């Protein structure tokens, strides 16, 4: 499953309403209509396994899958055997059938490629008996009881109403993602009330109905439908503020770099916004390709300002065979493209 | 109180085994599954796998299936991602997150720090620093050029300048090597009164430059 966010990075200001985007390739919802109750389920095979029956377990464990088809086959080889010729030898049968019922109830409940938590549901491990052929045996399927509820907890399900397997997260530069909002609509313990989400199918959204300081993040959409989890692409919230234009600066190579070879020149972009900017380099008013690197800071915290470096590197030989050096500089601020010009010979 | 707490940052070259690890605190760790995820520079959250700590069961995204090995010990409260050989692709950040699958739930309360993932033939080498020197404010800096792995730490005057510095991110350069520079903004006639000193420190190459930054 595809999560595409919209906008990808959008600019917003303090106290500002916020609603980000997440579509889906497929539908993350699953369940609603008519149920997985496991108290009741385990309760009444609990009640039946009293009324039929140290276990020896083998040395193989099995998953919920296999387990739960064990224990339907072995109902199953009763039952194929099982002549009734008085009244214990019919209550036994009819109860064999309200254990078959129950077990393959609580299978095709689980056993279903649509089942969101099915593979988390198989790592468990479950113990199988080393022989299953007679009604004494049940006691091994009693004792898995507990750990049968356990799993059954991670796929329960009561009311008709559906749920969206799909999240949220933000994230700050260099800090790990931290859930904000889980099944579409959750609010997380701790988490701001200024922070909502609602959606169904393949559309969900996230709101910030008065954006604050600490709001300027990235956010991630992450859908649980589905194994592989997949997230979305991220919507960067970045701080607006009134159009700067840059202060450039143009940085000849040092003599000790340009005695070992190389010249490296720097021109520099100081605390500008927006952050978009492009740097052209000329030398003898030729425009350079190629042997340029561009680096920018992240927004800053009190100016909401970026800088930007951009570096041409040349071999000693290419730099002194030009004269003028030059860096032209467009930007928004800007109302003509600025140019921070050197010769060579100081 | 509930806390994942992963390995420190990894340099390696390519082909290397490599064994990363996640610690669980403030809960039982046995009770709650713990999923592998990656994010590359740019590039967003990947899904890799998950543990069941209670009983070794795991399962993988098919993409990464056969490449990493997901094992935990529950006795030290610990899961581990392995690689028998990695490859410049495996460079990332790696997290480890708790599962929270009750009922409807399935989501990732708490997660780990992150651990690095540095993919690299590059050995360690210490950085060359060369001023930008300054021609009513004067900008003025440094480069610190042709260093392996990252980071290096830049300061003024012994840190005593802080106002106006802007040390740029690392750009990794086609040779293998990364590159910096960092400037800051001074008043202009500070430039005949103040010495600018730019402190370099490269730790994996014990490498620390001290350089004077003269206008000319």
């Known amino acids: 499953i595809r999560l595409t966010q919209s906008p990808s990075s959008f600019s917003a200001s303090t106290g500002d309403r916020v609603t980000i985007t997440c579509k889906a390739s497929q539908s993350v919802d699953y369940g609603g209509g008519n149920h997985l109750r496991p108290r009741d389920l385990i309760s009444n095979i609990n009640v039946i396994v009293l009324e039929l029956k140290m276990c020896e377990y083998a040395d193989e464990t099995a998953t919920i899958v296999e387990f739960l088809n064990r224990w339907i086959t072995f109902s199953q080889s009763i039952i194929s055997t099982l002549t009734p010729t008085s009244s214990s030898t019919k209550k036994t049968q009819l109860q064999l059938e309200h254990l078959l019922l129950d077990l393959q109830m609580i299978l095709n409940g689980i056993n279903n490629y649509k089942n969101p938590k099915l593979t988390r549901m198989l790592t468990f491990k479950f113990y199988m008996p080393k022989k299953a052929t007679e009604l004494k045996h049940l006691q091994c399927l009693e004792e898995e009881l507990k750990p049968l509820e356990e799993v059954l907890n991670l796929a329960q399900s009561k009311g008709g109403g559906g749920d969206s397997y799909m999240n949220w997260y933000q994230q700050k530069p260099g800090k790990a993602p931290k859930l904000l909002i889980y099944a579409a609509s959750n609010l997380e313990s701790g988490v701001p009330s200024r922070f909502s989400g609602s959606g169904s199918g393949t559309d969900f959204t996230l709101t910030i109905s008065s954006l604050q300081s600490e709001d300027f993040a990235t956010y991630y959409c992450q859908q649980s439908n589905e194994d592989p989890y997949t997230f979305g692409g991220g919507t960067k919230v970045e701080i607006k503020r009134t159009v700067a234009a840059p202060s450039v600066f143009i940085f000849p190579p040092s003599d000790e770099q340009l005695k070992s070879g190389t010249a490296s020149v720097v021109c520099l972009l100081n605390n500008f916004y927006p952050r978009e900017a492009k740097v052209q380099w000329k030398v003898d008013n030729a425009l350079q390709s190629g042997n340029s690197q561009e680096s920018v800071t992240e927004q800053d915290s009190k100016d909401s300002t970026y800088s930007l470096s951009s570096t041409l590197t040349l071999s000693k030989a290419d730099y002194e065979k030009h004269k003028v050096y030059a860096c032209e500089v467009t930007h928004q601020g800007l109302s003509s493209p600025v140019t921070k010009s050197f010769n060579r010979g100081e | 109180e509930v806390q994942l707490v992963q390995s420190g940052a990894e340099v390696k070259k390519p082909g290397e085994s490599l064994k990363i690890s996640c610690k669980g605190s403030?809960?039982?760790?046995?009770?709650?599954?713990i999923e592998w995820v990656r994010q590359m520079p740019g590039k967003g959250l990947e899904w890799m796998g998950v543990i069941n700590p209670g009983s070794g069961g795991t399962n993988y995204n098919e993409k990464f299936k056969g490449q990493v090995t997901i094992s935990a010990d529950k006795s030290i409260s610990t899961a581990y991602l392995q690689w028998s050989s990695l490859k410049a692709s495996d460079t990332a950040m790696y997290y480890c997150?708790?599962?929270?699958?009750?009922?409807?739930?399935?989501?990732?309360?708490?997660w780990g720090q992150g651990t690095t993932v540095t993919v690299s033939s590059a050995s360690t080498k210490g950085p060359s620093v060369f001023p930008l020197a300054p021609s009513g404010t004067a900008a003025l800096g440094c480069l610190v050029k042709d260093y392996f792995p990252e980071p290096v730490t830049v300061s003024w005057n012994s840190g005593a300048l802080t106002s106006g510095v802007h040390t740029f991110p690392a750009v990794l350069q086609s040779s293998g090597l990364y590159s910096l520079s960092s400037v800051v903004t001074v008043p202009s006639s500070s430039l005949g009164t103040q010495t600018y000193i730019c402190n370099v420190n490269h730790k994996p190459s014990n490498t620390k430059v001290d350089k004077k930054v003269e206008p000319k």
């Open positions: 997150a708790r599962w929270r699958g009750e009922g409807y739930y399935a989501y990732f309360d708490v």
């Open positions: 403030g809960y039982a760790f046995t009770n709650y599954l």
